[PDB]
């Protein structure tokens, strides 16, 4: 890749919500933004597995934040969709209650959760602070690993 310098290029962190709390991923990981419907839950999987989505003829397994994370589960709405991002090289989809913006941010800004934060580490990035809020970047690495294995995923 041939990189250019002639202007600014910030870091684009997609915000979105769930129940009263914000999380963002890098743009650069949000692959699509899908609408929250048809859904179709699959049997034996843990309850944070909402189900599978059929995008244009391909499996895709979709995650609840909320269950996974363990959030009051409030603020679904017509707003809610599914982010679509790759996850060791497979499509996943994560349900959100709305994408509400897309914001630059220094890099440097971001900081190393404290070893207990708003959600487990494993799943935390980074903690970038934006308005006067609290912006987690979700690490995708673990969203799927159920002990050592990976649900629907591997």
Do not use: C, W
């Not at 990981?29 to 859904?39: N, Q």
């Not at 989809?93 to 971001?110: C, K, M, Q, W």
């Amino acid at each position: 890749k041939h990189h250019h310098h002639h202007h600014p290029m910030p870091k684009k962190i997609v915000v979105f919500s769930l129940a009263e709390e914000l999380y963002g991923l890098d743009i650069f990981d949000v692959h699509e933004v899908v609408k929250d419907v048809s859904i179709t839950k699959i049997p034996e999987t843990p309850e944070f597995i909402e189900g599978i989505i059929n995008l244009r003829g391909k499996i895709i397994p979709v995650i609840d934040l909320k269950k996974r994370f363990g959030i009051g589960k409030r603020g679904k709405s017509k707003d809610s969709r599914i982010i679509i991002v790759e996850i060791l090289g497979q499509k996943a989809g994560l349900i959100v209650d709305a994408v509400h913006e897309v914001i630059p941010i220094d890099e440097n800004s971001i900081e190393p959760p404290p070893p207990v934060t708003t959600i487990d580490t494993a799943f935390v990035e980074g903690i970038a602070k934006t308005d006067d809020k609290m912006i987690i970047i979700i690490k995708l690495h673990f969203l799927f690993e159920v002990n050592g294995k990976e649900m629907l995923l591997n």
